[PDB]
Design a protein around this nucleic acid. Structure first.
Ligand SMILES: [Zn+2]
Ligand SMILES: [Zn+2]
Ligand SMILES: [Zn+2]
Lengths: 97, 84, 171, 162, 533, 279, 112
RNA sequence: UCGAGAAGG
DNA sequence: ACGTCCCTCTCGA
């Protein structure tokens, strides 16, 4: 069943944040991507049942992060990349404000 | 890294969202074999156990209320007022 | 060398631990990971200092997961070698290409090329050793070596040294 | 999860982490912590005696085995490094006593030479200043060969009866 | 099991930094160079080809692991390759801003047309904004068609043309008309001063203007361009990429062995186009490329109403959901909904095996997936699923704590109930479950108007949680009794209606009387009757 | 369009109403900081009516023989007639009640008195009489300075924004003004004894209940007023334009409405029915 | 002054069918349009041009268009918006996500 | 698995 | 350059 935009808004008005995440991550999509600490995009090779992480190009085997995001977003970021756009995912902030 | 426990502006009363997440978190935790500090009166449901912990105010949780600028005001469950 | 660094690390606890020896198992799990651990950045993190006055800070409860993460702060004894420092050590290995030297937690290897010309080798020795004009490098002798280069191998930073330059070798 | 912090040759050109100005754990520009073999062996020992006292709340090359049983109590045997380290330290330490070590630190830390040089000078026994400035390259002009040998000779008397 | 475990430290994204790819970074992260426009067509046999599709990209077959990260389909994210273009090529969404930069920089020296001396420009460069600064410079630079020598120095001082585009490329006129090739503007952009392009509206490392012209194109992995089994059948974007390489590998042999001016300038605007329609296939002029049919460009993949953002990320098709015809019930309580037996035996909630429900759960597990108070799966702490519907050990299975029992939803469970209009937060409330027969959602009579729902063929959505946190989320925030007083109109949104409303008037009259026998039946019908006559 | 433009907005932990940028839209949500569900259309008896009936209902003059409280309306009645040090507080009360009447006639210029306000006072004094069984023949046990001082001390505790500096205190003073003008209107000294017939315990219970129900009616920081406000006009517009009754010509101008909702939102300088109302 | 006439017009069309809506919702939308300096339209150009995050602005009308100017002008997303966490499968800073829950080890020993 | 049509609140 | 919301079915390369 579709939990569409119309239904999303009612949970926002209700303030049911933890549920809205569950209804949109445990009920569909969800993925375990490995992103580079340098460039925030999904280049890391995840040889995990051998324990070897690396990101050729910006060679590093130490600054890698696991993130939980919808596979439709992983698809979307990969789609923007094929259009030459870098949507770098950073696990920390800098703007403050 | 900025706030003092004597300079407190946010309301001393616990919001409906604070109670709802504290209850769910404790209930989720009790469901995961977490130690129950309240005296258990024969309950099979962790939500009721979490409500009993809230009634006797025996939850070790503490809310960090993030203000728009980046400040955060720490309020223990123990010290928050539950009217609602 | 040998250094004392103000490190930090984040551990995640399952909700079943939330009660008594909470502060203790965090301290225990901090040692279980960082003790005897080697990183390419800081080298051999050997000993966590001052177990008593160890900070714990508050623990953030995860979103849909019940676990909690703690930023633990600590001070430790570390050992990262460098290309150019002279270190003394005890010989361990002895092969046709050279000999390894136990300098602390780390093994440094010297090549037969990285030894002076008067240094010969005796494989038919019990134990096998490197003879010379007046000195002999036995299988367990004490030697002063200059680290020529270092390489970071997962969780064991190894090195290559020399005794060909002056003021190196004998003890 | 791996180790975090707050922020390469022996020619004072050390790592980015291992530079002179580095942040305190509270947050102040403090000098880097370099410690010679004797300065090290003692610091690990006193921190392991601290640990044995906390778990309770619930002469000659023969200290090798008394430290070996302490390491079997305080820390797990899953740490061959700290075992190999303490064996190496006690076998290569120039000063065994806390008083002699501190007196060494008094002499060394007045010259104002780089901490790594301070550590490497308390670890390696040198006679000629030509021998000293050659094994630790970073000196050369930092200390007078007479003044350096003045320290070397002062340090040679301060050596523990090993 | 789902997805395996990786030692990598988990975090959450906190900053999404948008930039541009440098054709060096594309070449650096790419596995191998895509050179053959073939799929599995080594000999159309078992393997793929070391040219396109899994030449170190990512597995195509179900029972085969990835050539790089040998992890296989589920958990393997797919890794990028690349195509080195024979000649630089404009970008579709940047073709406008590429023009707008040339209207500001020197077409000979690369400096700004008006630097840091002209009054209105210095009011403009002081605007420390973003594209609002870029707008002020572009208007105050497009007019001047020359540079300067000093005026009380700044270089050169050559003449600038009147540049306006032609669907695919740019032309400028001096006074003599000349077409501005891609390679030409590429050199102009790379010579733009480090201070100039940054103050224009770009970035020194994330978005350099020279990266709006593509020198190396990133080949996306098979997941975004999959292969269907109808003995196969590729995706439209796989077809389009073969067309790009076909136009590319020609222009390479044209410019090497041959040297005709018209032929090399011919296949270049073709490659300029195939890279263009690959991203957007809805351009100003342009034939809107068709392949034996149109073609779905990547912009159409991301376009609103559906397309990832609006239809896959802001709204998702979701598990643990139900929908059936609704009927009305006067004997049901307000804050509960009638769920058919069929739906309860299909929908599940995973209860962690804890010393409280262990006896209740073992009873349910050994009941079965077809008996009402039962369970469908039981998930061990070892992370594997035990299908109680088929497993040989299903009859016994001794339970352990820390396990999960995917048990049928039973009475007085929090669910989400929803009418399709969905306009007020009162159109989505939490109900108690009361498992009932017949195939309808039977809800209470007075919670009619908040949903705006009758029973003339109406259909309603039901969602069920899966965590104990989001059960509290529904029961403590979204429950029906809480919503009784609406904030939208500071008045209550539910009330007595129809038969209950017509009868309450016919009853509350002075003309109305009831005798002893029927009075007693009315009193017992009140649940909270004090037992006092 | 609405929902997508307002979702960001919510009530933050300092009662400011901000988007994702942190830009302030409202300094107190609803210009009073109150949740919408806890609000009911109350009546401000002080604005409407003749000035002559106003004195009959609120004025208490201890320095009089006809316009004083009869010692049958309360215990300290004959020992209070002519009390100079107390009549100064009676004047202070009646001077604030007259300030209210002029102040309300500034805001609601048309003379409307029924407006939505938190806490139903008329129901509280109703339940007080129903609970403590007040006898309208025996006199009250309240002093004159029990009522007026208890009401003044009640307003000090009716809090919306907690703060330190005068910026917050003076804006908090604004956030309550209306409800205080009603509180003064319903807890005038004459009213409390002459027609409410209250006792000391019953009147304390009323003050305690007013303080509590008010503190509940406050918004909860985290309320998603952004999408909530968008939804609040969304469902009506989905209705609306329920066509009935005919009249063209002016066609009652913008009786638009559903295309004016269009017109208003995208502004659009070309208006469909502009009209200057010259007074 | 224009703010009040804006509310007056939208109150007239809602109260054209009796209906009634509490002042706060309409004054919210009115202030939202107002608090900018002038009148900002509620369309793809009027409020969507704001300096907010790219990921929440593309989810309105102009989708791929904004994401292209984002890579060109090198934007950075705060993630403090609603629709960002939604796209990212993250618990939003909405209601129950407007705070964080911690545990006090002192309280853990306090309550035995 | 994409495009065209009919139908329910 | 936008041009409501979800549902159920059946037809074509
Ligand atoms: Zn990287
Ligand atoms: Zn792979
Ligand atoms: Zn020029």
């Amino acid at each position: 069943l579709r939990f569409g935009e119309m239904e999303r808004d009612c949970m926002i008005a209700h303030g049911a944040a933890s549920f809205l995440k569950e209804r949109l991550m445990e009920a569909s999509d969800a993925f375990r991507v490995h992103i580079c600490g340098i460039c925030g995009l999904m280049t890391v090779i995840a040889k995990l049942n051998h324990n070897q992480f690396e990101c050729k190009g910006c060679d590093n085997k130490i600054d890698i992060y696991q993130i939980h995001i919808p596979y439709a977003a992983k698809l979307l970021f990969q789609e923007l990349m094929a259009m030459n756009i870098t949507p770098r995912l950073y696990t920390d902030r800098s703007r403050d404000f | 890294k900025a706030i003092p426990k004597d300079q407190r502006a946010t309301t001393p009363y616990m919001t409906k969202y604070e109670r709802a997440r504290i209850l769910g978190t404790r209930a989720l935790q009790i469901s995961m074999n977490a130690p129950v500090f309240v005296d258990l009166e024969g309950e099979t449901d962790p939500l009721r156990i979490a409500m009993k912990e809230l009634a006797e105010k025996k939850i070790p949780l503490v809310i960090r209320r993030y203000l728009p600028d980046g400040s955060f005001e720490d309020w223990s469950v123990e010290e928050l007022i539950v009217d609602l | 060398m040998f250094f004392i660094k103000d490190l930090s690390l984040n551990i995640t606890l399952h909700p079943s631990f939330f009660g008594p020896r909470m502060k203790q198992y965090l301290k225990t799990k901090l040692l279980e990971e960082v003790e005897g651990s080697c990183t390419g950045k800081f080298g051999y993190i050997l000993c966590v200092l001052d177990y008593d006055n160890i900070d714990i800070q508050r623990g953030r409860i995860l979103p849909t997961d019940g676990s909690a993460e703690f930023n633990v702060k600590y001070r430790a004894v570390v050992f990262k070698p460098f290309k150019g420092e002279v270190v003394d050590g005890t010989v361990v290995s002895c092969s046709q290409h050279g000999f390894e030297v136990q300098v602390g937690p780390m093994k440094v290897f010297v090549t037969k090329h990285l030894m002076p010309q008067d240094l010969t080798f005796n494989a038919g020795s019990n134990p096998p050793s490197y003879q010379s004009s007046e000195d002999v490098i036995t299988i367990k002798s004490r030697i002063r070596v200059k680290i020529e280069g270092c390489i970071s191998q997962v969780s064991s930073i190894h090195a290559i040294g020399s005794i060909k330059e002056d003021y190196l070798g004998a003890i | 999860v791996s180790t975090s912090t707050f922020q390469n040759a022996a020619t004072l050109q050390l790592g980015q982490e291992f530079q002179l100005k580095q942040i305190n754990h509270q947050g102040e520009e403090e000098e880097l912590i370099a410690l010679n073999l004797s300065e090290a062996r003692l610091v690990i020992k006193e921190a392991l005696v601290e640990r044995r006292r906390a778990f309770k709340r619930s002469t000659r090359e023969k200290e090798l085995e008394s430290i070996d049983v302490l390491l079997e109590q305080t820390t797990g045997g899953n740490n061959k490094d700290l075992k190999n380290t303490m064996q190496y330290l006690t076998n290569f330490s120039r000063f065994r006593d806390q008083e002699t070590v501190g007196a060494v630190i008094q002499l060394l830390k007045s010259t104002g030479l780089h901490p790594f040089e301070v550590a490497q000078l308390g670890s390696l026994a040198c006679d000629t200043a030509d021998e000293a400035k050659t094994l630790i390259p970073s000196l050369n002009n930092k200390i007078s060969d007479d003044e350096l040998e003045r320290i070397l000779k002062e340090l040679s008397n301060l050596e523990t009866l090993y | 099991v789902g997805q395996q475990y990786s030692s990598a430290p988990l975090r959450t994204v906190k900053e999404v930094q948008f930039g541009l790819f440098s054709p060096e970074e594309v070449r650096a992260i790419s596995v191998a160079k895509i050179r053959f426009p073939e799929t599995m067509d080594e000999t159309q046999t078992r393997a793929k080809i070391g040219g396109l599709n899994d030449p170190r990209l990512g597995s195509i077959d179900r029972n085969l692991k990835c050539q790089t990260c040998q992890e296989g389909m589920n958990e393997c994210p797919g890794h990028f390759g690349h195509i080195d273009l024979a000649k630089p090529v404009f970008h579709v969404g940047f073709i406008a801003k590429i023009k707008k930069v040339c209207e500001c920089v020197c077409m000979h020296c690369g400096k700004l047309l008006l630097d840091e001396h002209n009054e209105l420009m210095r009011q403009a460069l002081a605007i420390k904004d973003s594209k609002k600064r870029f707008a002020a410079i572009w208007t105050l630079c497009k007019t001047k068609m020359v540079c300067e020598t000093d005026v009380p120095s700044r270089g050169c001082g050559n003449t600038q043309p009147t540049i306006r585009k032609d669907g695919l490329k740019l032309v400028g006129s001096w006074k003599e008309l000349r077409v501005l090739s891609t390679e030409e503007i590429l050199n102009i952009f790379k010579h733009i001063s480090v201070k100039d392009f940054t103050s224009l509206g770009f970035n020194e490392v994330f978005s350099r203007p020279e990266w709006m012209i593509l020198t190396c194109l990133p080949v996306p992995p098979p997941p975004v361009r999959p292969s269907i089994s109808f003995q196969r059948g590729e995706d439209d974007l796989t077809f389009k990429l073969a067309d790009i390489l076909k136009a590319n590998i020609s222009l390479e042999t044209l410019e090497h062995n041959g040297a005709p001016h018209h032929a090399i300038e011919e296949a270049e605007s073709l490659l300029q186009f195939h890279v263009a329609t690959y991203m957007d296939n809805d351009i100003a002029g342009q034939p809107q490329a068709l392949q034996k049919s149109p073609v779905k460009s990547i912009r159409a993949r991301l376009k609103g109403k559906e397309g990832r953002i609006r239809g896959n990320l802001m709204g998702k098709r979701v598990d643990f959901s139900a929908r059936t015809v609704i009927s009305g019930d006067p004997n049901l309580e307000l804050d509960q909904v009638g769920v058919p037996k069929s739906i309860a035996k299909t929908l599940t909630y995973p209860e962690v095996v804890t010393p409280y429900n262990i006896d209740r759960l073992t009873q349910l597990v050994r009941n079965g997936p077809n008996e009402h108070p039962g369970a469908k799966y039981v998930i061990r702490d070892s992370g594997d699923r035990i299908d109680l519907r088929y497993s040989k050990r299903a009859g016994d299975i001794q339970l352990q704590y820390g396990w999960k029992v995917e048990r049928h939803i039973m009475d007085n469970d929090p669910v989400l109930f929803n009418r399709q209009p969905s306009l007020h937060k009162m159109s989505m409330m939490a109900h108690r479950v009361k498992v009932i027969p017949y195939s309808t959602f039977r809800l209470n009579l007075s919670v009619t108007s908040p949903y705006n729902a009758d029973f003339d063929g109406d259909e309603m959505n039901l969602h069920v949680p899966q965590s104990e946190e989001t059960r509290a989320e529904l029961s403590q925030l979204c429950a029906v009794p809480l919503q009784i007083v609406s904030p939208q109109s500071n008045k209550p949104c539910m009330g007595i209606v129809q038969d209950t409303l017509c009868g309450i008037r016919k009853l509350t009259l002075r003309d109305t009387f009831i005798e002893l026998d029927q009075v007693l039946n009315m009193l017992y019908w009140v649940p909270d009757w004090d037992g006092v006559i | 369009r609405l929902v997508k433009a307002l979702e960001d907005i919510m009530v933050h932990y300092d009662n400011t109403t901000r988007n994702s940028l942190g830009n302030v839209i409202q300094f107190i949500y609803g210009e009073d900081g109150m949740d919408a569900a806890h609000i009911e259309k109350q009546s401000l008896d002080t604005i409407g009516g003749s000035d002559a009936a106003f004195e009959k209902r609120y004025r208490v003059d201890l320095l009089n023989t006809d316009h004083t409280l009869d010692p049958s309306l309360l215990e300290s009645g004959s020992e209070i007639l002519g009390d100079l040090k107390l009549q100064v507080l009676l004047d202070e009360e009646y001077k604030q009640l007259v300030k209210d009447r002029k102040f309300l006639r500034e805001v609601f210029v048309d003379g409307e008195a029924n407006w939505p306000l938190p806490v139903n006072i008329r129901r509280i004094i109703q339940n007080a009489q129903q609970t403590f069984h007040i006898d309208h023949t025996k006199p009250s046990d309240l002093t004159i300075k029990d009522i007026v001082l208890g009401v003044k001390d009640l307003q000090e505790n009716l809090l919306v924004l907690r703060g330190k500096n005068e910026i917050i205190q003076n804006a908090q003073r604004d956030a309550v003004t209306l409800f205080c003008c009603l509180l003064r209107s319903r807890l005038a000294t004459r009213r409390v004894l002459q027609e409410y017939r209250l006792t000391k315990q019953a009147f304390d219970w009323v003050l305690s209940n007013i303080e509590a129900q008010f503190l509940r009616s406050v918004v909860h920081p985290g309320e998603m007023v952004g999408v909530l406000a968008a939804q609040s006009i969304g469902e009506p517009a989905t209705q609306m334009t329920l066509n009935t009754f005919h009249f063209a010509g002016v066609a009652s101008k913008k009786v638009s409405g559903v295309p004016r909702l269009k017109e208003i939102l995208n502004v659009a300088k070309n208006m469909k029915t502009p009209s200057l109302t010259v007074y | 002054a224009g703010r009040a006439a804006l509310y007056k017009e939208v109150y007239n069309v809602i109260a054209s069918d009796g209906s009634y809506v509490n002042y706060r919702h309409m004054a919210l939308l009115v202030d939202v349009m107002t608090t900018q300096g002038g009148l900002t339209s509620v369309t793809r150009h009027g409020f969507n041009r704001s300096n907010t995050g790219a990921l929440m602005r593309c989810s309105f009308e102009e989708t791929v268009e904004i994401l292209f100017e984002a890579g060109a002008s090198a934007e950075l997303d705060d993630c403090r918006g609603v629709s960002e966490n939604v796209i990212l499968g993250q618990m939003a800073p909405i209601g129950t996500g407007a705070f964080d829950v911690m545990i006090d080890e002192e309280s853990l020993v306090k309550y035995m």
